[PDB]
Amino acid sequence: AEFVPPPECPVFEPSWEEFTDPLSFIGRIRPLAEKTGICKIRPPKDWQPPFACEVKSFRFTPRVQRLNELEAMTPREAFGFEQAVREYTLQSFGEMADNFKSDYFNMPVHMVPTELVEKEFWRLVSSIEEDVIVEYGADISSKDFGSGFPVKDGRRKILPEEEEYALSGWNLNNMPVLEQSVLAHINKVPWLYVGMCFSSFCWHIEDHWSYSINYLHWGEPKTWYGVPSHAAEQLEEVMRELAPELFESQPDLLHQLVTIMNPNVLMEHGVPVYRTNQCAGEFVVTFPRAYHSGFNQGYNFAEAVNFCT
Ligand SMILES: O=C(O)c1ccnc2cc([C@@H](OCCN3CCC(F)(F)CC3)c3ccccc3Cl)[nH]c12
Numbered sequence: 241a242e243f244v245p246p247p248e249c250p251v252f253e254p255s256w257e258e259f260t261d262p263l264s265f266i267g268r269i270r271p272l273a274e275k276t277g278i279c280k281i282r283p284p285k286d287w288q289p290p291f292a293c294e295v296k297s298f299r300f301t302p303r304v305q306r307l308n309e310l311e312a313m314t315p316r317e318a319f320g321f322e323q324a325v326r327e328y329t330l331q332s333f334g335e336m337a338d339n340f341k342s343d344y345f346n347m348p349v350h351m352v353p354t355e356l357v358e359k360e361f362w363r364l365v366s367s368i369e370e371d372v373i374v375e376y377g378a379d380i381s382s383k384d385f386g387s388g389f390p391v392k393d394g395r396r397k398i399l400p401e402e403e404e405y406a407l408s409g410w411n412l413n414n415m416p417v418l419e420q421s422v423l424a425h426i427n428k429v430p431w432l433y434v435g436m437c438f439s440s441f442c443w444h445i446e447d448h449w450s451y452s453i454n455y456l457h458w459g460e461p462k463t464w465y466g467v468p469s470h471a472a473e474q475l476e477e478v479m480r481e482l483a484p485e486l487f488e489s490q491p492d493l494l495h496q497l498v499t500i501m502n503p504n505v506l507m508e509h510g511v512p513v514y515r516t517n518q519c520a521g522e523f524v525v526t527f528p529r530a531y532h533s534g535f536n537q538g539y540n541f542a543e544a545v546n547f548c549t
Pocket residue numbers: 376378379431433440441442443444454462496497542544
């Protein structure tokens with residue numbers, strides 16, 4: 241009945257020598273990590289970049305997420321107007337996020353086990369008797385208020401001890417993003433995610449089957465699920481069988497907007513699924529054509545970008 245957590249994805253703790261070049265390190269761990277779709281990378285203990293976003297002016301209107309919107313398809317009066325719209329600052333969103341989680345679980349936010357949030361999230365996704373609605377500060381461009389990493393673009397002050405992180409190859413602004421093609425000779429910045437408890441992203445792969453790298457700057461963990469690329473067709477077949485028939489004929493780019501599926505359903509159909517809790521200061525790398533999904537344990541701040549090799 242209750243959710244069965246998938247097996248854990250690989251976690252790498254590179255030494256300072258191995259941490260010199262990201263693409264070199266990802267290329268070496270590839271024989272294992274590409275068989276799990278996702279992997280987690282813990283930087284050395286003394287690698288701690290500062291938070292370089294413009295906090296005072298950081299404002300956004302998050303998207304409203306109804307956890308059980310797909311199950312509800314199986315209409316309500318005045319549908320399409322369920323939730324009033326709120327604009328937040330970073331502070332007011334965190335106050336809302338902490339108040340929501342502490343009130344939902346009736347305990348301090350840091351005392352809620354990650355396994356309980358995970359079990360409750362997937363129960364609410366399939367629940368028709370309880371309509372839980374959360375908000376997600378998703379797809380906030382790093383050009384709006386700056387990246388979470390320090391950037392030497394002469395827009396915000398950089399301290400001498402912070403210049404190492406502005407020049408680091410693990411700075412998401414310094415990842416290679418230019419794909420090779422003939423059209424590139426004839427003729428992208430990171431995105432930010434401000435999460436709260438139960439805010440989520442559904443199953444998808446990246447454009448051009450690209451790699452992606454994800455960094456959690458601060459906050460409560462982000463729970464991930466990943467499927468290796470050799471099982472990509474198996475996942476799409478399970479979707480074709482069990483996803484809502486009204487969305488069956490939709491192209492992949494549109495279907496991926498609502499490809500919500502319990503990982504146990506995929507595992508029951510023979511699809512290998514791996515999980516991880518990405519904590520503050522840790523990287524998550526997704527490999528080409530590796531389907532991934534997840535949700536946030538609480539108030540946190542993430543940065544993500546697609547990169548090419
Ligand atoms: O939230 C995280 O941590 C996280 C980690 C990894 N991948 C994702 C992907 C997303 C979301 O956007 C995907 C599509 N957009 C990607 C960025 C873009 F600029 F190209 C514009 C299109 C999303 C997807 C499905 C349902 C809800 C949400 Cl919110 N969130 C992720």
